[PDB]
Design a protein around this ligand. Structure first.
Ligand SMILES: CCCCCCCCCCCCCCCCCC(=O)OC[C@H](CO[C@@H]1O[C@H](CO[C@H]2O[C@H](CO)[C@H](O)[C@H](O)[C@H]2O)[C@H](O)[C@H](O)[C@H]1O)OC(=O)CCCCCCCCCCCCCCCCC
Ligand code: CL7
Ligand code: CL7
Ligand code: CL7
Ligand code: CL7
Ligand code: CL7
Ligand code: CL7
Ligand SMILES: CCCCCCCCCCCCCCCCCC(=O)OC[C@H](CO[C@@H]1O[C@H](CO)[C@H](O)[C@H](O)[C@H]1O)OC(=O)CCCCCCCCCCCCCCCCC
Ligand SMILES: CC1=CCCC(C)(C)[C@H]1/C=C/C(C)=C/C=C/C(C)=C/C=C/C=C(C)/C=C/C=C(C)/C=C/C1=C(C)CCCC1(C)C
Ligand SMILES: CC1=CCCC(C)(C)[C@H]1/C=C/C(C)=C/C=C/C(C)=C/C=C/C=C(C)/C=C/C=C(C)/C=C/C1=C(C)CCCC1(C)C
Ligand SMILES: CC1=CCCC(C)(C)[C@H]1\C=C/C(C)=C/C=C/C(C)=C/C=C/C=C(C)/C=C/C=C(C)/C=C/C1=C(C)CCCC1(C)C
Ligand SMILES: [Fe+2]
Lengths: 31, 63, 30, 65, 420, 284, 34, 28, 23, 37, 323, 59
């Protein structure tokens, strides 16, 4: 299979996920 | 042709059928009786095509 | 008396009736 | 009410018959080029009249006609 | 008029029959009229199918279903599934039409003329839904009638003409059953048989002795149970484990009818004994096996089998899915372990070889009576399941009191402790 | 405070995080069994002799497939409608080879679905609300029972049931179209109208409410009723087609006056069905 | 195998009995309004 | 190794279900 | 041919309705 | 085929089976008379 | 008050129906599109373009009438009634398939007029025009299927002919040649549509079954019911209805992108690793491979007659079979 | 007596249709009960008698 298939899947999984988690964390810290 | 690709077939075309190096020359086909027939070319649509060598007059000779 | 609604009703009904007659006529074709 | 009834009674069946006769008298076949049931093929003209050229399509149909 | 409007009942016209819940006389009239409808349909359809009957064509080719039911019971049939005369069918249809006339008269009479609420006229016929004893007794009486009916069917099978047994020698023949099965071990083996392909629950009955004995047993039980219901009270736990209202009884009946409809579909689609293939046409299994055997006959005439998963001799191809199918025209060519090839070499009597092709053509353009019955009654059974759910839920809620909506100021969810 | 009473008050209690109830008592084990076996047999499971011809077909992830192409293959053609419990099997490897996991999954799953409907009713009762969510839920239930149970019953074997996989579903759809011409069956047209119209009405209702919120009850009744009725109809259509009562057929309809046949779109559709069918039917 | 079959049968019977006795145990008194 | 990618995404989905069910902020 | 009896029944029904409808 | 005595009444039977449907339709006609009150 | 203000007020005046400025584009175009379809089904045949009998005069059924697409030789010619093809001859215009172009183009402008109409009505009433944004999805589907797809192909001949069985032919053609079911965007479209139906059904049932005994339903009871039955529930009404709006529209847009992809044969037709692994050994058989075989069969058995203009001649020997 | 039998059945159909029309009106509205009740019950009795007569007249 594509050697970049796993990398593309991983980055697709990760980047929006870390974005959303960062937004939620900097929301919840605030009152 | 740009109408023979795919959405997730990635990379350059040479990653596909490979890189060309030489043209084998125009081929011509003959049957037992010596009649000169031709192969019908695959249109853009078909992913696979049935090979059919037909007489120029429109009669299928071999396949 | 030529209200816009009159126009609309007729623009619908006239061809509708004509085509209904035509289709009925086709039904009796052998 | 009552008044329009006269007009519709006089007219609507006339329109119905208009469509009826438009089909029955065979006018539709000429108007729309639709073949008569015998015009699909001659006694042996079983080939299909398919257009092969964009530029002279109407004349080619005239040949097919 | 009064009570026939939305204001005086609370039910819209589209739920008009709901108004009949507590009007005993008119409700009884509606039931009687509806029974008249059913029997009118029976008689009318019988007369229609007789009027369009054609003696040369088979029933299943001809396309008759009410006639096949009578043919199974043997009214005017002969050996090998041949009619002798369509007169008894006419007799049955006419009787049903007359009975429908009488029932319709009674229904109209109670609907309009007779008393509206029997409670005013008398007390045996005046009943209220929430009277548990009265409902028990009525259920018992009707159970007794059903039991008499079942025993009547058994008596017909034993003394009056019998039934068309398609396991009689040389093709089917009308027979009178003389040795009913009564061993209880057989009955338990039938009940506790797997509903799956591992046998068949009750659909797997293949001889008529078991059918007649089963009807005998059930009629006896129905009469006994009716007497028991008349003579006793509902137990305390029974009184505490049900809902006692008209709609609840309707929902229970709906559930029972849904179950019966599914079972009837199973019977008509998998059974070739109590639905003789001579009349309803071959089952899907019978059609596939007949096709396989006819092809084998042709291939043996001009100069295919295999092993079962358990290792017997079965046919090959798709038809392996019907490896365990048993049939009258195929049973003589059996063996201890599957149909032997040697038997198929020289044991095919002419009538079996004719039945094979006759069934191969009519595989269920052409739609078998089995297809009609199966599809219609599967759809009916599913919708009756839906109705069972609807009415059971409504009965439970109405008995509880929250049927017409949640109460704004005493809402129950507002008092529960939050789960988070 | 009898031990039995304490147990009953535990199960039929509105303070659990998820309501259990008596129907849930059956729902939980059956659903857990189905989920566990589905996961196990979808990750890794041997090839299955779907055609009952000693030739296998693989469908698991560890045997090469991905999510789009993987599936749980239906039980073998030789088994027919026979239940195939593990303890009724010659050998575990053989039992896998005949497709037992499919049977396990579908049976536990169907029992769990019907018990889930019951649980919906039960909790609607326990909370004091009109109990007709279950009636609405009965439509997709009917659809699943059609593809998984009723169609194999009509066809005589579970090998004709729907595969449990994304591509298996499409293969099932195409074979069904080939053998029964479902597109030209009016009930499937009702189902298509049902789903498309349900989406239309959902979009309209959502847009209206969210635009103005910045008999009207009959509106929500119609919302609930329309797609449910259409799904009932299309499930019944599938069920009827399970008994060889196929849809409409207009092939070879118009004929020339002398005796020739003029093609219509229905003939093109029939030829497409012919292609699908002849590619099916390994032998004859 | 034999252990598995026994355990499965016992479980099915137990769960079915639980269902039955639950629904006969006066579960018409669980509604809010009651 | 694709199997690992698929299984990891699936396990993350199941964990998300667990947290979304038992750890949602209380509606009010 | 058979439309006569069907029309007769179609007359029979609503006539039965109408005779009550007069009172 | 009907008994040869009854054959004369063949057309009537031809409309018997579809009679029940009318009853259902009849209901709305009844509810048409009272104006769906 | 100039003529323009008089005209504007006259358009906005209350009637049985509201015209507005949008009406000037919507009503003529919608009416012409509908009339074109009715005429094409009633009288005009496709005997010369597809060699079919797709009209009532021919004796077709309601399920088999179709305003069939123009011939293949015309490419993407607009087929104006006065163009180089028709040259003002109405009969040749009909026979060549110009009714398809007439209907489709006037349909495009009718859809545009309808979206503008919803904008205008929402402007008059004074509420957010979420209805227009919702309707944006159907326009995307229409433009992707009836314009972009035949434009990416050889001719209008490959567009969906306006009908019922013709649309079914289009569906089967798409599966055979583009393997559409395996396209992820079509999968998102299917999920969107089925989820929209699911949302409509359960929302209706919930609102009916949490009615107060007199908005009008117990949101608290509904929330608790779904939380304890399913696990999750909407605790916000605005979110609930915006989600109902959002799901089907998104499904339609995803499917639209899928359809524009296959318009260029940029189709997800196969998985490379599966093809390689099947090439290595013939025992390896999965459902995807059998789907591929079905596609081969459908292509081979449909091409000789569907694309009659190509004069395909495949003998019985080359036709794939399950031997 | 075959023609007699056919005429009898025709009369049976006539009476049956007459009862079909009359019975709902007589039963629903008992405003003219004095003659209506006699009419309807006599029609029923004639119906029963005619059916019983035809029973033997068949053979
Ligand atoms: C209180 C409620 C209690 C409920 C308890 C439920 C317990 C389990 C229920 C399982 C239901 C059946 C599952 C399918 C099993 C099956 O293989 O079914 C097959 C059986 C018949 O089995 C067949 O029976 C045949 C009988 O043939 C034999 O007998 C024949 C007689 O002519 C011939 O002789 C024939 O040749 C001979 O072999 C054969 O033995 C076959 O091998 C055998 O498979 O069908 C039948 O039992 C007919 C009835 C079931 C068919 C439809 C079930 C639908 C269930 C509800 C779905 C809808 C729910 C509503 C929501 C939507
Ligand atoms: C489909 C699910 C269903 C089933 C099978 C079912 N019911 Mg109900 N049902 C009743 C009896 C009943 C009986 C005796 C019975 C079994 O014989 C059933 N039901 C069965 C009455 C007590 C009560 C009042 C019913 C009442 O007063 O009137 C009934 C109303 C109507 C419009 C009947 C017209 C039928 C529809 C047009 C369907 C068309 C089918 C088609 C013609 C078939 C032929 C094909 C054709 C295309 C050729 C009742 C109701 C009601 C409902 C509802 C929703 C149902 N049901 C549903 C069912 C009330 O609101 C309502 C209710 O309870 O409100 C309080
Ligand atoms: C990250 C920087 C980047 C950008 C923004 C970019 N490319 Mg590339 N790019 C190409 C097109 C392209 C287009 C049409 C385009 C803008 O639309 C871009 N690119 C844009 C192809 C001509 C060419 C290879 C074709 C090629 O591989 O095209 C991409 C293939 C696929 C399956 C991606 C399709 C993805 C789906 C839509 C996802 C949507 C999900 C959904 C929304 C939710 C290419 C390459 C390539 C590279 C590389 C390293 C890049 N790129 C990089 C980029 C090749 O190897 C490679 C190269 O140069 O050698 C071959
Ligand atoms: C149109 C819906 C409908 C159906 C199809 C229907 N009824 Mg009614 N229906 C009756 C019989 C009946 C039978 C035998 C029957 C079987 O087909 C039906 N109905 C069916 C009578 C017992 C009864 C008197 C007429 C009746 C009524 C009544 C109504 C109303 C509104 C209805 N209905 C309605 C229906 C009384 O007020 C009214 C009512 O209940 O007031 C007490
Ligand atoms: C033969 C037409 C008809 C039918 C089929 C019929 N009844 Mg009657 N019928 C009753 C029940 C009954 C049931 C449970 C039932 C179900 O099958 C029927 N009927 C059916 C009783 C409530 C009631 C008393 C008869 C009784 O024995 O109690 C009754 C009558 C009565 C009449 C008459 C004339 C009828 N009927 C007629 C019918 C009373 O004298 C008579 C009457 O007007 O008294 C009130
Ligand atoms: C078997 C003889 C008989 C017949 C056929 C019969 N009943 Mg009963 N019968 C009822 C309905 C019923 C219906 C609707 C019905 C129609 O078919 C019948 N019955 C029929 C219920 C209202 C009522 C109790 C609920 C009831 O009958 O059943 C629910 C409770 C139990 C434990 C049986 C179902 C549980 C298991 C699946 C067992 C299945 C047995 C199978 C062979 C294997 C009832 C009784 C009861 C009895 C007894 C002894 C009977 N019966 C007997 C019968 C109560 O104790 C008891 C009683 O005290 O009545 C006063
Ligand atoms: C699904 C629930 C149900 C419904 C709503 C239903 N059927 Mg059936 N149904 C039919 C028509 C029908 C029509 C036209 C119709 C309405 O559209 C229905 N059904 C409706 C017939 C084609 C067919 C034959 C009907 C048939 O033969 O019915 C006769 C049955 C009975 C009890 C006669 C009543 C007898 C007296 C009460 C007792 C005797 C008194 C004593 C002497 C003194 C049929 C059946 C049958 C059954 C069963 C279980 C059903 N059904 C069930 C239903 C057959 O096995 C059975 C079957 O197919 O296999 C035998
Ligand atoms: C706009 C998009 C908005 C949404 C955000 C983005 C969504 C997700 C995007 C994921 C991209 C994943 C790329 C995987 C690459 C891969 O597998 O191979 C990796 C490939 C390259 O592939 C490599 O090529 C080499 C030769 O150069 C060799 O052939 C290697 O063998 C080969 O693997 O990477 C790229 O091509 C990267 C650039 C991608 C460009 C995409 C252009 C098309 C965009 C269309 C957008 C349509 C949006 C529709 C929305 C509805
Ligand atoms: C007659 C026939 C002809 C062919 C030959 C053959 C041998 C097959 C013969 C068949 C004879 C047979 C099979 C006889 C046996 C019939 C049997 C076992 C019928 C059993 C049916 C089981 C049923 C209802 C289950 C009922 C349980 C119910 C309701 C629920 C009850 C309770 C619950 C849990 C909810 C609330 C209400 C209540 C009462 C508390
Ligand atoms: C509705 C339905 C469901 C329940 C059963 C029931 C039988 C009732 C069934 C009804 C069926 C029937 C009989 C439907 C009849 C439908 C028909 C034919 C309606 C047709 C109306 C016809 C119309 C507009 C035609 C308009 C034509 C126009 C502008 C022509 C446009 C033109 C074109 C196309 C070429 C250039 C010139 C010009 C003039 C611009
Ligand atoms: C109703 C309707 C539906 C939708 C709403 C809408 C407002 C449009 C409304 C409008 C119009 C319609 C469809 C009206 C339909 C009216 C009809 C067909 C009424 C007919 C009722 C027929 C009935 C009783 C027939 C009963 C026959 C019986 C006893 C038996 C008769 C007999 C038998 C078979 C034995 C031989 C002798 C004899 C007398 C022939
Ligand atoms: Fe809402």
């Amino acid at each position: 299979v594509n050697d970049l298939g796993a990398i593309a899947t991983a980055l697709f999984v990760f980047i929006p996920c870390v974005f959303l988690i960062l937004l939620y964390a900097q929301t919840a810290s605030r009152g | 042709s740009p109408a023979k690709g795919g959405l997730f077939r990635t990379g350059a075309m040479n990653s596909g059928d490979g890189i060309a190096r030489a043209w084998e020359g125009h081929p011509t086909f003959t049957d037992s009786e010596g009649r000169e027939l031709f192969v019908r070319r695959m249109p853009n649509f078909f992913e696979t095509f049935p090979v059919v060598l037909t007489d120029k007059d429109g009669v299928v000779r071999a396949d | 008396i030529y209200t816009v609604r009159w126009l609309a009703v007729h623009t619908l009904g006239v061809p509708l009736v004509w085509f209904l007659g035509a289709i009925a006529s086709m039904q009796f074709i052998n | 009410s009552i008044r329009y009834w006269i007009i519709h009674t006089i007219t609507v069946p006339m329109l119905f018959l208009a469509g009826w006769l438009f089909v029955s008298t065979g006018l539709a076949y000429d108007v729309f080029g639709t073949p008569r049931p015998n015009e699909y093929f001659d006694q042996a003209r079983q080939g299909l009249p398919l257009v092969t050229d964009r530029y002279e399509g109407k004349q080619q149909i005239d040949e097919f006609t | 008029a009064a009570g026939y409007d939305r204001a005086t009942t609370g039910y819209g016209w589209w739920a008009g029959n709901a108004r009949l819940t507590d009007l005993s006389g008119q409700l009884t009239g509606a039931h009687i009229a509806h029974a008249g409808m059913i029997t009118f349909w029976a008689g009318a359809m019988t007369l229609f199918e007789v009027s369009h009957f054609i003696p040369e064509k088979p029933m299943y080719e001809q396309g008759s279903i009410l006639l096949a039911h009578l043919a199974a019971e043997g009214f005017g049939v002969g050996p090998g599934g041949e009619v002798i005369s369509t007169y008894p069918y006419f007799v049955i249809g006419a009787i049903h039409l007359i009975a429908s006339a009488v029932l319709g008269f009674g229904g109209l009479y109670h609907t309009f003329r007779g008393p509206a609420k029997f409670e005013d006229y008398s007390d045996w016929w005046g009943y209220d839904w929430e009277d548990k004893e009265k409902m028990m007794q009525i259920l018992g009486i009707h159970l007794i009638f059903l039991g008499i009916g079942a025993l009547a069917f058994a008596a017909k099978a034993m003394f009056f003409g019998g039934l068309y047994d398609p396991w009689a020698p040389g093709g089917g023949n009308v027979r009178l059953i003389t040795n009913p099965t009564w061993n209880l071990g057989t009955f338990l083996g039938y009940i506790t048989r797997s509903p799956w392909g591992e046998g068949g629950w009750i659909v797997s009955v293949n001889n008529l002795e078991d059918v007649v004995g089963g009807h005998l047993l059930v009629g006896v039980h129905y009469i006994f149970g009716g007497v028991f219901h008349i003579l006793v009270k509902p137990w305390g736990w029974v009184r505490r484990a049900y809902v006692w209202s008209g709609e609840a009884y309707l929902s229970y009946s709906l559930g029972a009818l849904y179950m019966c409809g599914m079972i009837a579909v199973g019977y008509v689609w998998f059974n070739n004994t109590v639905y003789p293939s001579e009349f309803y046409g071959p089952t899907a299994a019978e059609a596939s096996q007949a096709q396989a055997m006819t092809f084998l006959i042709r291939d043996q005439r001009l100069g295919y089998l295999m092993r079962s998963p358990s290792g017997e001799i079965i046919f090959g191809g798709e038809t392996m899915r019907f490896w365990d199918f048993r049939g009258p025209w195929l049973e003589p060519l059996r063996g201890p372990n599957g149909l032997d090839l040697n038997k198929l070499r020289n044991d095919i009597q002419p009538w079996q070889a004719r039945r094979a092709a006759e069934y191969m053509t009519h595989a269920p353009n052409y739609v078998s009576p089995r297809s009609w019955l199966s599809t219609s009654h599967f759809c009916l059974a599913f919708f009756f399941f839906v109705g069972h759910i609807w009415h059971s839920g409504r009965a439970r809620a109405a008995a509880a009191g929250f049927e017409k909506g949640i109460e704004r100021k005493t809402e129950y969810a507002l008092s529960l402790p939050d789960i988070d | 405070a009898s031990a039995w009473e304490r147990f009953c008050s535990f199960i039929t209690s509105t303070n659990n995080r998820l309501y259990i109830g008596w129907f849930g008592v059956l729902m939980i084990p059956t659903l857990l069994t189905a989920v566990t076996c589905f996961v196990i047999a979808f990750i890794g499971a041997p090839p299955v002799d779907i055609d009952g011809i000693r030739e296998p077909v693989a469908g698991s992830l560890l045997y090469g497939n991905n999510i789009i192409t993987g599936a749980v293959v239906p039980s073998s053609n030789a088994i027919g409608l026979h239940l195939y419990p593990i303890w009724e099997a010659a050998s575990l490897d053989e039992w896998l080879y005949n497709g037992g996991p499919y049977q396990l999954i579908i049976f536990h799953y169907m029992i769990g679905c019907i018990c889930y409907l019951g649980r919906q009713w039960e909790y609607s009762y326990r909370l004091g609300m009109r109990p007709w969510i279950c009636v609405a839920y009965s439509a997709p239930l009917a659809a699943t029972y059609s593809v998984f149970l009723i169609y194999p019953l009509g066809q005589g074997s579970f090998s004709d049931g729907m595969p449990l996989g994304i591509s298996g579903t499409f293969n099932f759809m195409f074979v069904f179209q080939a053998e029964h011409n479902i597109l030209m069956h009016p009930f499937h047209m009702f189902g298509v109208a049902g789903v498309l119209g349900g989406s239309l009405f959902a979009a309209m209702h959502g847009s209206l409410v969210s635009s103005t919120l910045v008999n009207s009850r009959s509106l929500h009744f119609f919302l609930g009723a329309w797609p449910v009725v259409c799904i009932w109809l299309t499930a019944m259509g599938i069920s009827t087609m399970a008994f060889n009562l196929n849809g409409f057929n207009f092939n070879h309809s118009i004929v020339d006056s002398q005796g020739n046949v003029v093609n219509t779109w229905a003939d093109v559709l029939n030829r497409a069905n012919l292609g699908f069918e002849v590619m099916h039917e390994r032998n004859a | 195998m034999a252990i598995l079959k026994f355990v499965t049968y016992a479980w099915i019977i137990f769960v079915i009995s639980l269902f039955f006795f639950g629904f006969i145990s006066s579960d018409t008194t669980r509604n809010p309004k009651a | 190794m694709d199997v690992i990618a698929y299984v990891f995404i699936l396990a993350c989905i199941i964990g998300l279900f667990f947290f979304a069910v038992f750890f949602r902020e209380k509606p009010t | 041919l058979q439309l006569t009896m069907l029309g007769a029944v179609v007359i029979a029904g609503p006539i039965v309705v109408l005779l009550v409808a007069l009172r | 085929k009907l008994p040869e005595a009854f054959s004369v009444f063949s057309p009537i039977v031809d409309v018997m089976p579809v009679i029940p449907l009318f009853f259902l339709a009849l209901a709305f006609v009844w509810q048409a008379a009272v104006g769906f009150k | 008050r100039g003529w323009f203000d008089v005209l504007d007020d006259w358009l906005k005046r209350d009637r049985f129906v509201f015209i507005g400025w949008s009406g000037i584009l919507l009503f003529p175009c919608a009416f012409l599109s509908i009339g074109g379809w009715f005429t094409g089904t009633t009288f005009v045949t496709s005997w010369y373009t597809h060699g079919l009998a797709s009209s009532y005069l021919e004796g077709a059924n309601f399920l088999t009438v179709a305003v069939s697409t123009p011939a293949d030789s015309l490419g993407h010619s607009l087929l104006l009634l006065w163009g180089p093809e028709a040259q003002g001859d109405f009969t040749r215009w009909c026979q060549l398939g110009g009714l398809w172009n007439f209907t489709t183009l006037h349909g495009v402008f009718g859809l545009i007029g309808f979206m503008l109409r919803q904008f205008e009505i929402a402007r008059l009433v004074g509420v957010r025009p979420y209805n227009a944004v919702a309707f944006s999805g159907p326009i995307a589907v229409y433009v992707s299927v009836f314009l972009m797809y035949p434009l990416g192909q050889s001719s209008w001949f490959f567009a969906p002919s306006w009908g019922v069985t013709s649309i079914f032919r289009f569906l089967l053609f798409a599966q055979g040649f583009h393997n559409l079911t395996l396209n992820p965007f079509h999968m998102m479209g299917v999920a969107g549509i089925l989820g929209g139906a699911l949302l409509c059904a359960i929302h209706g049932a919930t609102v009916e079954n949490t009615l107060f005994e007199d908005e009008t339903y117990s949101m608290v009871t509904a929330n608790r019911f779904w939380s304890q039955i399913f696990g999750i529930a909407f605790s916000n009404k605005r979110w609930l209805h915006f989600f109902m709006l959002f799901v089907p529209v998104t499904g339609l847009w995803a499917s639209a992108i899928g359809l524009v992809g296959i318009a260029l044969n940029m189709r997800a037709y196969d998985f490379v690793s599966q093809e390689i692994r099947a090439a290595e050994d013939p025992e390896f058989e999965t459902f995807y491979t059998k789907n591929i075989l079905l596609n081969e069969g459908l292509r081979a058995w449909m091409a000789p007659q569907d694309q009659i203009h190509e004069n395909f001649i495949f003998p019985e020997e080359v036709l794939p079979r399950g031997n | 007596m075959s023609v007699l039998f056919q005429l009898l059945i025709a009369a049976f159909v006539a009476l049956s249709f007459a009862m079909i029309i009359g019975v709902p009106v007589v039963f629903s509205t008992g405003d003219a009960s004095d003659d209506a009740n006699k009419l309807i019950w006599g029609g029923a009795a004639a119906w029963v008698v005619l059916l019983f007569v035809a029973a033997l007249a068949s053979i």
